[PDB]
Amino acid sequence: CAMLEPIETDEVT
């Protein structure tokens, strides 16, 4: 298919 590339919450930075 086509996986998204949305970012998530940073672990420390």
Partner 1 sequence: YEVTGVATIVSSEETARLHALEDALFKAVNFSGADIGSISNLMPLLEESRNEYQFTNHEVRYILVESERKRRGKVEVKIRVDIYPSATGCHTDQYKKTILVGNIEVASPQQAVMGQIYQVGDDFSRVVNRQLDQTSRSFVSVGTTDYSISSNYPARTQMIAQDNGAQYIIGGVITDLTATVESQLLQDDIINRQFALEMKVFDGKTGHEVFNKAYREVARWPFAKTSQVDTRSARFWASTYGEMMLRVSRNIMLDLESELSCKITLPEVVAVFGNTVTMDLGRMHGVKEGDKLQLWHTASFIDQNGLPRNKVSQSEITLTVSRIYEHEAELTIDQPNLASSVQIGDVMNKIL
**3-state DSSP of the chain:** CCCCCCCCCCCCC
Q: Rounded to the nearest whole angstrom, what is the least distance from the CB of residue 4 to partner 1 in the complex?
A: 6
Number of shown-chain residues binding partner 1 (CB under 8 A): 13
Contacts (CB under 8 A) with partner 1, residues 1-13: 1-13
- The type of residue at 1 is C
Direct distance between the N- and C-terminal alpha carbons of the chain, in angstroms, rounded to an integer: 30
Site for partner 1, rule CB under 8 A: 1-13
